Amino acid sequence: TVSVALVLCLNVGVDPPDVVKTTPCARLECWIDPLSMGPQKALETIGANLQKQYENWQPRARYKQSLDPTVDEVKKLCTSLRRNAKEERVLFHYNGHGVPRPTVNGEVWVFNKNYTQYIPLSIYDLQTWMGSPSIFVYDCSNAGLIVKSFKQFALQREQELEVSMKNCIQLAACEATELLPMIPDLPADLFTSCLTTPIKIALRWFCMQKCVSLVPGVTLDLIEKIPGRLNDRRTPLGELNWIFTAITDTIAWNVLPRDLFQKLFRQDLLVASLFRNFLLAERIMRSYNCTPVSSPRLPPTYMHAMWQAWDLAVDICLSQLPTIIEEGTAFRHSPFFAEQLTAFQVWLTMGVENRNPPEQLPIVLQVLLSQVHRLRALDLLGRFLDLGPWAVSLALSVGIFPYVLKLLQSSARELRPLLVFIWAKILA
């Protein structure tokens, strides 16, 4: 992916003239409320948290920023990105914030800090500059309008070349016909936020909206104070991250076609992160008139029943949370992975070759990471691969094969016999 563009169309929190917003519409950005600070910090700290939040995805990427892009900063930025990534994809962000909303042309309004000091930029110009493949993140009040405009202009480029398009990824906040609703509970950069800290955001949304008493004593204060690093499983954040990624990958493998799943979720870390978070955010965002939009032909993964288990993973974990935060209680590992491995063994116990294959093979893929459940998963794989030859080939198709291959670089000679048995069957 090489390089990233961070385009900041921030008119120091100045509202546009084409809206009239309610009193609790002073919605923050990047967990920062720019309306409480002046230009030197209202424009700077947002960029700082963007840089941190995206280095958390890929610190290797060539991050470039453009605050108040006027004319030539845009051209220099996208030219540099083309030069670094002539063949590879280029990621490219939007906010559409500030004075009048994004339009079909592709204008920016940050020339000289005024409603009238706008700039008639064109999407066609950027598409011409981005002759290489591209990834776009449209976090805008009318992001679907921008998606439709970009699809039409990329189609225009494709038609001009035939008489970059067809290698483009696009993710956006909403549909062109649906503006982002005035919900005070949401941050203004909804689609940047939800793809950035999906764990606490989903927890907050369900705590607010899932009007259930199944988890008493849990409030948004606790959700904002959950300890963890998203990999330290001793705290709720690591366990929830692991379970959520497992659920999302499993549902996508079950539902999405292999041509798109095996490239989006495997050939790039950030693309996988954005699409996983996008499916979860889609499940959240369909509830109100904020219809998400996406470039690839992905069926509606939110409809899948396994998302219900997501709530259970929350319902168990949050049940411990009030004493995890307040009393410092050590987290108790969730039964999700044990239950799903039991489901895999149930499918094996059915003893039928040509039912629908096991849905939990991606769960096995993400359970081969750590010993404590990898041992059960490996025993189950040894049982599974004695089925017909399809059981072998699917194990290569799911992505278990690279993980077992990687597991065959360890020194655990007490574990190597099982691993070699399994790997001998997967490669057959």
Partner: peptide, 8 residues
């Protein structure tokens, strides 16, 4: 290869 950390 792997998209996650592994106890290896």
């Amino acid at each position: 290869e792997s998209q996650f950390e592994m106890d290896i």
